[PDB]
From TrEMBL, chain C:
This is Capsid triplex subunit 2. InterPro entries: Herpes_capsid_2. GO terms for cellular component: viral capsid. The keyword Translocase does not apply. Disulfide bonds join C1-C82. The gene is UL18. GO terms for molecular function: structural molecule activity. Keywords: Capsid protein, Host nucleus, Virion. It comes from the Viruses. The keyword NAD does not apply.
UniProtKB/TrEMBL annotation, chain D:
GO terms for cellular component: viral capsid. The gene is UL38. This is Capsid triplex subunit 1. The keyword Heme does not apply. Disulfide bonds join C82-C209. It comes from the Viruses. Keywords: Capsid protein, Host nucleus, Virion. It comes from Human herpesvirus 2 (HHV-2). The chain holds residues 106 to 466 of 466 of the full protein. GO terms for molecular function: DNA binding. GO terms for biological process: viral capsid assembly.
From TrEMBL, chain F:
It comes from the Viruses. The keyword Transcription does not apply. Keywords: Capsid protein, Host nucleus, Virion. It comes from Human herpesvirus 2 (HHV-2). GO terms for molecular function: structural molecule activity. This is Capsid triplex subunit 2. InterPro entries: Herpes_capsid_2.
């Protein structure tokens, strides 16, 4: 909302004004990664014991 | 599939209310409540100095 | 009525306070319709545009521009004037001040230029703040359109001299138009602006078609219908002007546009559109000169 | 503010609003004491400029300035005045029977001689007798007529049309089947404009007059397209025939009628719902 | 003959003889020559059983 | 106002409802005076006569016998309009939206012109019901009369194409600077001929028996442009009058007939009001309460009645 100021002359009257704006989210999806070696799974499943 | 939109914030501002006394230039004025001044048009302000 | 308040400037002389009282009912042309208006904006010095005080041409441009206003009540430090052109049709009855013709029960008055009569008549000049109010003359439309063509005719006889045009008898009025002693030297020099338009746009109007019709009808339905109406009426003066005077498409077509806008402006400058109407009630309906008349908004 | 009133004290030599109805298109009589002077000008000198001085001088003889300037020609008074002029018989003799019984027909014969003479010396009956209103009341004495006959546009027939249905209110009779030339034969539903049209023709039927009304949903600036059509009287050869002033708006297209009730059987039209937007005359060619 | 959108006869004598005899007394016979755009304006009889 | 409702017929596309949301303050040409109307009688398909759509002269000919109205409120099913030619009887002062490259003034008379500039297309599209709505261009009356005189003489160039093929433009308008480009595409014969006839007709009635007395003063003007500054700007450089000098003939019928006074009024009545017969009549006058002296291109202007 904006305040206004009275004057006296040919400069006009001042209506009270407003803005009422809206913004929009923009989204990024950011990535990490890691792998496991092939003979490292068979330790975890219990196949290689 | 679940899809939706949402609103996230309604931020408003407070109107900054000031009275005229709070400024520093309240010294230089002598503000008197003097009604019906425009109903006379005769310019006569006199005081003894 | 949305009566816009014209502000008197700061203190004036006592004869200047009484002079603006007798203007109660004159016509005032306000440029904008702010509810607060100064009086210098109203005055004739605010009509100065080209660095000169205007003639009746420059007044009729300005009078066809800004908005009319009748002074309702004259107040201390304020003038309360309701404008004409705001409001719906036929609302807000108010009083005009009559000037010498009759202004009958109807007749649709026109707020037309002050120098159509004696030069410094009605020029209310405040000596204190040193400004000038030239109030215009409220005349009805057939009496408006007659006289504004009557004075521009007179300047032609003065523009190159050798019946007195200025009789114009009305229903009860023997209208003395001639102020011979000092005004006809000053009224003729003010239509110097308006005459030279009126001469040109005729001579640019006639001489264009005098070289159009020989260059047209020679390359359909234009030839059939136009000559069907001008059978020995304009063709009689076609042989008359081409013989008793002198005789290029591209200068002509570039002059076709230039005349038509200039001839179009004189339709708005002259011809004096009815601003307001008189329509009386409980009244004698035949208004004396200097008498108040009930006057309502739209034609 | 959708309400206005007029009031004018005139004489009963013309319209005589007693024998007239509550609905009457009162035209004026603008400037009777004029036209020895402008009848002289606005015409070639081969037009016998003393004619409006004499024929209206006979008309004032048919009955000094008086305490009431001569006004209020009715719309009734004009129908008989051009009854021999427009090409319509046995529908024009009825309105003349309404006048010579209820209004003296010597005031008609002196007036129709003026109607030929006005167009003779080129000073037309338009730019004369501007529209005046709708005749609310007639408080008329023996010699006077102080008629409240409201001008000022739309409300003048609605203020005499809202309370109209009970008893007999205005109804605004067109007063002739030959008059009220109801246009838009090629027409559909819409709010129409009323006009007041005077047609002319120089030396064909010797400066002829025709006084009637047209009704159209056509603009006054597009009416000249239709007024140049629909006539055979385009053969003057000077000019300025077919004048018209806007009577205003009829915003009820179904409400036009055909009846024969007055006073003498006078064929008539009920016109229910009128805007009296007063307008101005428009005559160039 | 209420609505013609077909070309007429060449012979104007045949063009009126085959009309004035046809539109002589049909109550679907228009009581004027036709306008260019619009209906034919069929007459109304005084009453109908 | 006599508020005229324009029914929005069928479905509506979600941008097509927003198409009407930005038109509050434009001008509807409606060919009647209705209290109820459907939208297709307004649209540019209804401008289309038998077989062809009108050209930029015939659009004015369509606009002449079609009544202007201004959108006052916007609803999804109705567009409440106010017919300027009738319903301008307002203490409400119906607003107008400037749709032009032009700042008008405060107080100038405003008339309507079809879209005739290169970038001011303004033809909206409705995908639900296929209608085009060429909105007219509200312009000041000195500007509009300076437009219409260009198209007429260009249409007369379309009559007879003598000189070789290097003609001057009549495609260039100046208004406070601002070299404006018109759209010069096609010139329909009847739209020329109906506009050509009235101009030739009106100028013949502007010459009366006392007109040739004014033709005597042609060397009187050329002496004045040699010694006055107002006359020199009045007789312009590309004037036929300056080429014309490259005649009283008393003949007086009655010798008192006021020979000038009839030649002025008849010229004023016939060739003076050429702006009413070529273009539409002015009815729109800019009336700004708050003290705005100008109305910007794209802004709103409160409007009162006839000039």
């Amino acid at each position: 909302h904006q305040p206004l100021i009275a004057r006296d002359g040919p400069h006009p009257v001042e209506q009270p004004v407003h803005n009422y704006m809206t913004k929009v989210i923009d989204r990024r999806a950011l990535n990490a990664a890691f792998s496991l070696a092939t003979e490292a799974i068979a330790l975890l499943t219990g196949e290689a014991l | 599939d679940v899809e939706f939109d949402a609103l996230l914030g309604s931020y408003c501002n407070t109107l900054s209310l000031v009275r005229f006394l709070e400024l520093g230039l309240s010294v230089a004025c002598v503000c008197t409540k003097f009604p019906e001044l425009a109903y006379m048009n005769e310019g006569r302000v006199q005081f003894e100095v | 009525c949305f009566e816009a308040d014209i502000a008197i400037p700061s203190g004036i002389s006592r004869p200047d306070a009484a002079a603006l009282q007798r203007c109660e009912g004159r016509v005032v042309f306000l440029p904008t319709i702010r509810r607060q208006l100064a009086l210098a904006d109203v005055a004739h010095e605010s009509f100065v545009s080209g660095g000169v005080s205007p003639d009746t041409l420059g007044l009729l441009l300005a009078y066809r521009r800004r908005f009319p206003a009748v002074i309702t009540r004259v107040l201390p430090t304020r003038i309360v004037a309701c404008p004409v052109d705001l409001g719906l049709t036929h609302a807000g009855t108010v009083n005009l001040r009559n000037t010498s013709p009759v202004d009958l029960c109807n007749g649709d008055p026109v707020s037309l230029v002050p120098p159509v009569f004696e030069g410094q008549a009605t020029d209310v000049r405040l000596e204190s703040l040193d400004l000038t109010l030239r109030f215009p003359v409220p005349l009805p439309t057939p009496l408006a359109r007659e006289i504004v063509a009557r004075l521009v005719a007179r300047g032609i006889r003065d523009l190159n001299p050798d019946p007195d045009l200025n009789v114009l008898y009305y229903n009860g009025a023997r209208l003395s138009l001639v102020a011979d002693v000092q005004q006809l030297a000053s009224v003729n020099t003010e239509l110097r602006s308006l005459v030279l338009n009126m001469v040109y746009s005729i001579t640019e109007g006639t001489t264009l078609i005098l070289t159009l019709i020989p260059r047209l009808l020679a390359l359909g339905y234009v030839n059939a219908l136009l000559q069907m109406q001008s059978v020995t009426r304009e063709a009689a003066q076609l042989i008359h002007p081409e013989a008793p005077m002198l005789m290029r498409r591209l200068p002509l077509y570039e002059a076709l546009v230039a005349w038509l806008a200039h001839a179009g402006q004189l339709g708005d400058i002259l011809a004096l559109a009815p601003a307001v109407r008189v329509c009386t009630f409980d009244g004698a309906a035949v208004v004396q000169s200097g008498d108040m008349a009930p006057v309502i908004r739209y034609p | 503010p959708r309400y206005h009133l007029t009031r004018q004290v005139t004489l009963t030599d013309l319209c005589q609003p007693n024998a007239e109805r509550a609905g009457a298109l009162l035209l004026a009589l603008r400037h009777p004491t004029d036209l020895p002077h402008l009848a002289r000008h606005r015409a070639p000198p081969g037009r016998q400029t003393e004619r409006l001085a004499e024929a209206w001088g006979q008309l004032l003889e048919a009955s000094e300035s008086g305490c009431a300037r001569a006004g209020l020609v009715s719309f009734n008074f004009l129908v008989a005045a051009c009854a021999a002029a427009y090409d319509a018989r046995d529908a024009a003799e009825a309105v003349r029977a309404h006048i010579t019984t209820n209004y003296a027909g010597a005031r008609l014969d002196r007036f129709s001689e003026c109607l030929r003479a006005m167009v003779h010396t080129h000073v037309f009956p338009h730019e004369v007798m501007r529209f005046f209103g709708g005749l609310v009341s007639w408080v008329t004495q023996d010699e006077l007529a102080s008629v409240t006959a409201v001008c000022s546009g739309p409300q003048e027939a609605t203020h005499t049309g809202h309370p109209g249905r009970p008893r007999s209110a205005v109804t605004i009779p067109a007063c002739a089947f030959v008059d009220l030339d109801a246009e838009l034969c090629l027409g559909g539903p819409g709010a129409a404009f009323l006009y007041l049209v005077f047609t002319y023709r120089q030396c064909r039927d010797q400066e002829l007059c025709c006084v009637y009304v047209v009704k159209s949903q056509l603009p006054p600036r597009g009416l000249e397209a239709a007024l140049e059509r629909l006539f055979g009287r385009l053969r003057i050869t000077t000019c300025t025939y077919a004048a018209f002033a806007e009577l205003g708006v009829m915003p009820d297209d179904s409400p036009r009628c055909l009846h024969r009730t007055e006073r003498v059987g006078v064929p008539v039209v009920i016109l229910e719902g009128v805007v009296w937007r007063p307008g101005g005359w428009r005559a160039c060619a | 003959y209420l609505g013609r959108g077909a070309p007429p006869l060449l012979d104007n004598a045949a063009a009126v003889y085959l009309r004035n005899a046809v539109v002589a007394g049909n109550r679907l016979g228009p009581a004027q020559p036709l306008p260019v755009f619009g209906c034919a304006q069929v007459p109304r009889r005084a009453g109908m059983d």
